Amino acid sequence: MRVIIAGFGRFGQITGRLLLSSGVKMVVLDHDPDHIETLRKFGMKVFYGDATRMDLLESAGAAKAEVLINAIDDPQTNLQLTEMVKEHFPHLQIIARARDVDHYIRLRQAGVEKPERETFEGALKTGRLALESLGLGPYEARERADVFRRFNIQMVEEMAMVMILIIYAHPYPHHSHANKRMLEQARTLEGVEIRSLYQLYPDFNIDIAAEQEALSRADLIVWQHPMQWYSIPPLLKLWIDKVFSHGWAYGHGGTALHGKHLLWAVTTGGGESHFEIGAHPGFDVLSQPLQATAIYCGLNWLPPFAMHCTFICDDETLEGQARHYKQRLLEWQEAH
């Protein structure tokens, strides 16, 4: 229906099995009598022949499909398919396997956004296993692989070619009601940049230098998120831990944030009264770790923006609250 997979070897099988687990229906283009049994069990419609055939492509539903996964092993065949689909089926999104760097480059030049070098991530994993058996902790080792990946991707992309900042930290931005409205409203302003952490770093691999650059340009920084267990989401905590670095956000020479302002914009399921609990009751006390973090780094902490009772929230209330968020924002701009 929405998905076509070309090639059902080792690579296509795992990609297909992951989609099938997530409830996605697909058809397969394959031409290996060896895969007949695998295909039988897999239980999807099969088009048996060369994927480069226009007739098989059309009968597979290419003119209506959203995504083609090009899992073809042979670079020449893999590229020929890519070129055919680009020419004949302009709305069909190509996700491609690449054999190696030369193949990756040719795919990039054919307009595939992020071709996946078939052994790359396996090889990085193997590197981490070696690091761990040499005595490195698994997390430090994964971080080292993350740094190398970013570097390597930047190098191969070069070979191929050859003021408000909202730090948004909802884990499921597509599923958001309250925060999503707040952001729609904020974008109607100017000099607003939005960085959605769970969209940028689903693998919890923050690019510190990219984050520091954006902060450098901002006058007001906003930490916007749904409250989770009286606190913030894991990825926002990671962002603080990584981005607010020694010699940059604090410590000797760490003055990059001095003079800037910070707003906490948080949504909660409960209402004010729910926070009257424990030794230090009241919603305002929960701002403490954040305010302490901001102050330590030389930021000016603003009165938080807080939207309560999203659990029982009227759509009329969701709107007025979102517009007051924009209003807080506008008012800060006019003062600065």
Ligand X SMILES: Cc1cc2nc3c(=O)[nH]c(=O)nc-3n(C[C@H](O)[C@H](O)[C@H](O)COP(=O)(O)O)c2cc1C
Ligand Y SMILES: CCN1C(=O)C[C@H](SC[C@H](NC(=O)CC[C@H](N)C(=O)O)C(=O)NCC(=O)O)C1=O
Token match 């979102």: residue? Answer: 322
| Measured distance CA(160)–CA(300) in Å, rounded | 44
Q: How far is CA 133 from CA 47, 127, 140, 144, in A?
A: 45, 10, 13, 15
Bridge partners of residue 166, in order along the sequence: 194, 222
114 binds ligand Y per the rule CB under 6 A: no
Q: How far is the CB of 172 from Zn ion (least distance, A)?
A: 4
Which one of ligand X, ligand Y, its own copies, none is in contact with 147 (Cβ closer than 5 to 8 A by kind)? Answer: its own copies
Retrieve residue 118's tokens: 């078939």
171 binds ligand Y per the rule CB under 6 A: no
Site for its own copies in 163-192 (CB under 8 A): 171-175
Site for ligand X in 237-276 (CB under 6 A): 241, 267-270, 274
| Measured distance CA(304)–CA(261) in Å, rounded | 12
Report whether 52 belongs to an annotated binding site. Answer: no
153 binds ligand Y per the rule CB under 6 A: no
> Looking at 118-126, 131-139, 179-187, 214-222, which segment touches Zn ion (CB under 5 A)?
131-139
Pick one of 235, 266, 307, 322: the residue that binds its own copies (CB under 8 A). 235
DSSP tally for the chain: helices H, then strands E: 13, 12
Q: Which is nearer to ligand Y, 14 or 130 (CB)?
A: 14
Site for its own copies in 192-211 (CB under 8 A): 198-199, 202-204
Pick one of 176, 212, 291, 333: the residue that binds ligand X (CB under 6 A). 176
Token match 């397969």: residue? Answer: 28
Report whether 49 belongs to an annotated binding site. Answer: no
Site for ligand Y in 116-135 (CB under 6 A): 117, 120
Retrieve residue 149's tokens: 């990946």
Report whether 177 belongs to an annotated binding site. Answer: yes
CA angle 329–247–141, rounded 5-degree value:
100
Contact indicator for 70, 98 with CB cutoff of 8 Å: no
| Measured distance CA(51)–CA(144) in Å, rounded | 39
Site for its own copies in 245-274 (CB under 8 A): none
Site for ligand X in 179-218 (CB under 6 A): 179
Contact indicator for 332, 220 with CB cutoff of 8 Å: yes
Phi, psi of 26 (to 5 degrees): -150, 165
> Looking at 7-15, 49-57, 174-182, 242-250, which segment touches ligand Y (CB under 6 A)?
7-15
Token match 């916007």: residue? Answer: 224
Contact indicator for 328, 189 with CB cutoff of 8 Å: no
Q: Which is nearer to its own copies, 13 or 321 (CB)?
A: 13
> Looking at 97-105, 135-143, 168-176, 276-284, which segment touches ligand Y (CB under 6 A)?
97-105
Contact indicator for 286, 275 with CB cutoff of 8 Å: yes
| Measured distance CA(200)–CA(215) in Å, rounded | 16
Residues placed in the known binding site for FMN: 170, 176-179, 227-230, 267-270
List of residues contacting Zn ion (CB under 5 A): 137, 140, 172-174
Residues placed in the known binding site for glutathione: 13, 99-101, 117
List of residues contacting ligand X (CB under 6 A): 170, 176-179, 226-230, 241, 267-270, 274, 310
List of residues contacting ligand Y (CB under 6 A): 9-10, 13-14, 38, 41, 99-101, 117, 120
Residues placed in the known binding site for AMP: 9-11, 30-31, 35, 50-51, 73, 97
